[PDB]
Design a protein around this ligand. Structure first.
Ligand SMILES: CCCCCCCC/C=C\CCCCCCCC(=O)OC[C@H](COP(=O)(O)OCC[N+](C)(C)C)OC(=O)CCCCCCC/C=C\CCCCCCCC
Ligand SMILES: CCCCCCCC/C=C\CCCCCCCC(=O)OC[C@H](COP(=O)(O)OCC[N+](C)(C)C)OC(=O)CCCCCCC/C=C\CCCCCCCC
Ligand SMILES: CCCCCCCC/C=C\CCCCCCCC(=O)OC[C@H](COP(=O)(O)OCC[N+](C)(C)C)OC(=O)CCCCCCC/C=C\CCCCCCCC
Ligand SMILES: CCCCCCCC/C=C\CCCCCCCC(=O)OC[C@H](COP(=O)(O)OCC[N+](C)(C)C)OC(=O)CCCCCCC/C=C\CCCCCCCC
Ligand SMILES: CCCCCCCC/C=C\CCCCCCCC(=O)OC[C@H](COP(=O)(O)OCC[N+](C)(C)C)OC(=O)CCCCCCC/C=C\CCCCCCCC
Ligand SMILES: CCCCCCCC/C=C\CCCCCCCC(=O)OC[C@H](COP(=O)(O)OCC[N+](C)(C)C)OC(=O)CCCCCCC/C=C\CCCCCCCC
Ligand SMILES: CCCCCCCC/C=C\CCCCCCCC(=O)OC[C@H](COP(=O)(O)OCC[N+](C)(C)C)OC(=O)CCCCCCC/C=C\CCCCCCCC
Ligand SMILES: CCCCCCCC/C=C\CCCCCCCC(=O)OC[C@H](COP(=O)(O)OCC[N+](C)(C)C)OC(=O)CCCCCCC/C=C\CCCCCCCC
Ligand SMILES: N[C@@H](CCC(=O)O)C(=O)O
Ligand SMILES: N[C@@H](CCC(=O)O)C(=O)O
Lengths: 135, 408, 175, 98, 49, 49
């Protein structure tokens, strides 16, 4: 129960930090099926969004501006941003209060904060996917 | 054989890119360039294709009184015949002796083609209206009360709290381990079971109709409530006919339409009939470019298949050959057009040029359906009710435990 | 007689997970995340409240309630009957959405009519219909005026690229 | 009226907008205008009455009187109720009536 | 309203009250068309149809 | 002897309810196909009216 808490912090910790949440392969087509090469292909994250093919330059920007569909998604990722942050909040609260319990209700009240983080992350993933299929 | 004072356009006159190889009359071509040929049958006179470099169709300009573009070429003696799209205004009649109209257009609306709407959070209860989902909940309680009253004041595990679980047990079809035991408790459990069989088989049935035949709405149709229900950007063209009709608005429903264009920003007008298409084409939110009709059914047809004409013909204005006030070639001109119209050679060119390109509309919308799988965004409201339902449930878990803790 | 030669409609192999086509893969991973997310909450909401629910009998309730069968225990508390309440409403909308689109994949691709005549191929501008060049067939559509063929020659003359092939062996390969 | 949705009637749009605004409102203008024409005040061929009336309709235009008459007999004639106004949803869910 | 028929039977209708010399000025909902152009005279179009 | 009566009646109620849900999803998606006439050329083909 300690290890699942220890492994839980790092895994979402990598995820909320990294820049590989969402890909993109916006291209073209030609007859004789002659599809495309790369035309526009951005990988993306939650805080640093890095273009890869349209300009090749990694404009990993703290999203407020440019550097058309891209920032529009980033305004919708902005709508789904706090829910993995709330899940990271309630996890670390559930993490420390579990170790205090090892050193009563102290272990049990931490188990509330794991499930409140998990139900925060389901609405996290849903609203993130609902934002993408919107765009 | 004098001056053709036309302008580079949609299919009336344009420079086709074969003039990068060819020459002669084939430098500038289109509908009206064919009309140049069958007017030459009667007048005898040839062409001189001069696209107006000043071309900004216009009239005499505001407070400078200089004529603009085409009439800037037509009126000043620089031109005499004006085979082109040229709209006959009565203030233009004050300047120009005309001919009789080719066709007639109206002020039209280029709205963008209705792309599929974004479903909301609560779009899962689309197939059953918002009166039924309130009739169910009061029939839920209205039946769960009658199980209680019957099974209490008669010969009992049916409280209230166990009777709101049988009725919810039957509406989600998940069944029951309680199973009422009188005759008068089985009739309530009976006709409620027939209620849930019809409503669930009407929800599934109607949702199988929304996901097969998807009729769509153009919400800015029928231009009177385009004006009244102001939602979208009333875009239009610039200097030329379409503003000057709305400047002189005396029909009040068009005047309050014009005041909203008078109070518009930043696109009160822009420019360029090609670009005015593009401002609809790329914005796609609210821009509602208010062009002339006969240009609108061309762009709609061509092959992007991405715009659509809502409403019809807010005025009636005509395309007639303009002649600069007396202009002796006029009587060969207009009698020719009459013999083109009454014989139907002008209507023959109508039959030709508006069926040249790749045909579109509902013509392309034949048997071409592939229908997509549901994304998460169609049932995403149920995941919000589901997780949000648990947040209520873990809340009552504290409240129940605190009412057993503060019981002590 | 002049006739039409198209590609035969061999159907496919469907790919053997094609039953979960009417719901996209984001739904089938969010059911399972909400199947664990409900079964854990049912465990906790009937543990420190007044027994028969472990985590293991709670997974059997949620899996029982999702395939709409009648798993046998019941929730018994107002804290507990809400978890079994909203999950019963979740499994009503998802299965009715599955039965809808699988009755919408089928009755849409049952509408789909293969081309069966010349005048059907007149309207269906999707398929490009190019005939032999320098032969009797090109002469037929150019000259005659049955007015179904006038429209067919019209789109054939506006070729993009050249639909006239040049020869029969190249024409069979072009289909 | 008597064919019950089996008979179409091709008539002019200026007449058509009034007919669908009479108290048995069960008619509707289907599509756009199939062409465009115009009403005209007629004189015999080569009449002395021509150019006074021709200069009248020009004057009657920018004064705003003739299009006030376009209002005057048509604006108030939504006495039927205009039930088309409260029907633009065309909703497709089942109602209680089903 | 108006017509034209087998020989001419001159212009059967309200234009027949205007082509025969039955009456002068004809304030009416009469439509302007090209057939009525050549036979009698008209105003400017005061409405749109 | 008893589980056969509950056996074939369970198969009876599977086919009837699936037949009810089919046609109610066939009354609706047929009368949702039904397009009112909206143009002249649509009324050209529709020889009913
Ligand atoms: C004390 C024991 C007896 C009382 C029953 C309590 C337990 C109830 C258990 C099950 C009943 C269904 C679930 C109740 C709560 C869930 C939410 C709900 O079912 O709520 C439905 C409506 C809220 O819809 P609205 O009016 O806010 O939106 C109107 C929007 N429009 C204007 C477009 C039409 O509220 C309502 O009727 C709910 C009525 C409340 C009862
Ligand atoms: C055009 C015309 C249309 C109509 C078509 C015909 C449809 C026929 C439907 C008939 C249904 C009506 C009721 C039939 C049976 C009567 C039974 C009855 O009235 O309620 C059962 C009662 C007492 O119930 P309980 O002990 O479980 O309550 C204990 C529960 N607590 C613990 C809460 C107190 O007595 C019992 O047990 C009785 C159990 C044994 C039955 C005795 C013999 C009955 C013989 C024939 C019945 C008629 C069948 C016709 C087919
Ligand atoms: C969230 C709350 C959901 C339900 C909470 C529990 C019931 C609340 C209630 O409301 O229970 C008031 C009492 C119940 O009485 P009981 O004998 O079943 O006690 C229980 C007998 N045991 C212990 C053997 C089951 O009084 C009654 O009978 C109420 C009788 C019917 C009242 C109308 C129900 C709908 C009201 C809607 C407006 C809000
Ligand atoms: C059996 C009968 C009870 C439920 C009947 C089926 C549920 C749907 C009824 C309903 O209407 O729900 C939907 C409501 C909102 O839909 P609306 O049309 O009312 O407002 C319109 C909202 N606009 C304008 C924003 C779109 O969204 C909601 O609240 C979802 C809440 C409904 C969850 C059902 C089960 C929850 C019960 C928990 C306790 C029961 C066990 C113990 C007693
Ligand atoms: C353990 C003890 C029993 C426990 C279960 C109790 C059974 C009840 C459970 C569930 C309810 C299902 C049966 C109730 C359904 C009502 C039947 C009904 O309402 O049918 C409809 C006909 C009216 O239709 P229409 O021709 O006028 O429509 C055309 C009219 N337009 C043109 C205006 C649209 O109503 C009529 O004629 C009335 C004439 C028929 C007389 C009743 C027979 C039908 C019900 C049989 C009950 C089955 C169980 C037998 C025990
Ligand atoms: C007994 C059954 C148990 C609970 C009763 C039903 C609970 C219903 C809660 C609704 C929350 C919701 O449906 O949230 C969606 C919100 C907007 O919903 P609204 O009701 O506030 O506005 C009206 C919606 N209209 C205008 C967009 C059409 O939009 C969003 O994505 C905002 C983010 C989602 C809300 C936070 C997640 C739920 C709570 C977690 C703790
Ligand atoms: C009370 C104690 C428990 C009692 C209930 C136990 C649960 C079992 C009950 C019912 C069965 C439901 C789950 C089993 C369904 C199989 C899932 C599956 O086979 O998924 C599909 C994918 C393979 O299809 P594809 O993605 O390549 O599609 C592309 C295919 N082509 C090649 C045509 C293009 O399989 C993969 O990838 C493999 C990767 C996924 C690893 C397993 C996760 C899925 C199962 C979750 C169980 C949920 C309960 C959790 C406890
Ligand atoms: C932990 C959770 C356990 C399961 C985790 C999720 C299961 C696998 C999901 C997944 O990550 O796989 C997605 C892949 C990706 O496919 P693609 O993007 O390459 O194709 C399109 C390629 N393009 C775009 C080039 C055309 O394949 C797919 O879509 C198909 C994936 C469907 C998996 C079916 C599992 C359902 C099992 C039980 C149902 C519920 C029972 C429990 C209650
Ligand atoms: N035919 C119009 C074009 C410009 C416009 O529509 O405003 C004109 O000459 O004024
Ligand atoms: N055998 C044919 C071949 C060309 C065609 O099919 O039109 C011929 O000689 O005319």
């Amino acid at each position: 129960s300690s290890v699942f808490a220890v492994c839980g912090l790092g895994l979402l910790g990598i995820a909320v930090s990294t820049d590989y949440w969402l890909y993109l392969e916006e291209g073209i087509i030609l007859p004789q099926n002659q599809s495309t090469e790369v035309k526009m292909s951005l990988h993306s994250g939650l805080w640093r969004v890095c273009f890869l093919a349209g300009e090749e330059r990694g404009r990993c920007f703290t999203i407020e501006y440019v550097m058309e569909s891209t920032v529009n998604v980033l305004k919708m990722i902005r709508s789904a941003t706090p829910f993995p942050l709330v899940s990271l909040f309630f996890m670390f609260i559930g993490f420390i209060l579990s170790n205090i319990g090892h050193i009563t209700i102290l272990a049990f009240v931490s188990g509330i904060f794991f499930i409140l983080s998990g139900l925060s992350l389901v609405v996290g993933l849903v609203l993130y996917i609902s934002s993408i299929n919107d765009e | 054989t004098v001056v053709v004072t036309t302008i580079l356009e949609s299919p009336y006159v344009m420079m086709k890119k074969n003039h990068e190889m060819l020459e002669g009359n084939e430098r500038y071509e289109g509908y009206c360039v064919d009309l140049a040929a069958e007017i030459a049958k009667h007048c005898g006179f040839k062409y001189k294709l001069t696209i107006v470099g000043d071309g900004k169709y216009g009239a005499r300009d505001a407070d400078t009184k200089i004529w603009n573009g085409m009439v800037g070429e037509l009126v000043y003696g620089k031109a005499d015949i004006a085979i082109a799209p040229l709209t006959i205004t009565l203030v233009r009649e004050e300047v120009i002796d005309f001919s009789k109209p080719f066709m007639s257009l109206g002020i039209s609306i280029m709205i963008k083609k209705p792309q599929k709407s974004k479903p909301g959070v609560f779009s899962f209860l689309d197939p059953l209206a918002y009166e039924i989902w309130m009739c169910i909940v009061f029939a839920y309680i209205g039946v769960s009360v009658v199980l209680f009253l019957v099974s209490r004041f008669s010969p009992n595990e049916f409280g209230i709290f166990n009777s709101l679980w049988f009725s919810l047990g039957a509406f989600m079809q998940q069944g029951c381990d309680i199973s009422p035991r009188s005759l008068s408790g089985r009739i309530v459990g009976g006709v409620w079971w027939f209620f849930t069989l019809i409503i669930i088989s009407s929800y599934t049935a109607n949702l199988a109709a929304f996901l097969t035949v998807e009729r769509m709405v153009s919400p800015i149709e029928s231009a009177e409530d385009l004006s009244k229900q102001t939602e979208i950007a009333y875009g239009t063209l610039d200097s030329g006919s379409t503003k000057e009709f709305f400047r002189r608005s005396k029909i009040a429903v068009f005047d309050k339409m014009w005041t909203y264009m008078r109070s518009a920003e930043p696109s009160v007008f822009v420019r360029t009939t090609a670009e005015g298409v593009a401002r609809v084409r790329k914005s796609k939110g609210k821009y509602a470019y208010l062009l002339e009709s006969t240009m609108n059914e061309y762009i709609e047809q061509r092959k992007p298949c991405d715009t659509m004409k809502v409403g019809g013909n807010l005025d009636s204005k005509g395309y007639g050959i303009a002649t600069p006030k007396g202009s002796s070639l006029g009587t060969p001109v207009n009698l020719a057009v009459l013999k083109l119209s009454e014989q139907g050679v002008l209507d023959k060119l109508k039959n030709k040029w508006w069926y040249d390109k790749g045909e579109c509309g509902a013509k392309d919308s034949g048997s071409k359906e592939k229908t997509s799988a549901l994304s998460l965004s169609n049932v995403a409201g149920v995941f919000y009710i589901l997780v949000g339902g648990l947040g209520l449930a873990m809340l009552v878990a504290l409240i129940e435990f605190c009412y057993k803790s503060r019981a002590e």
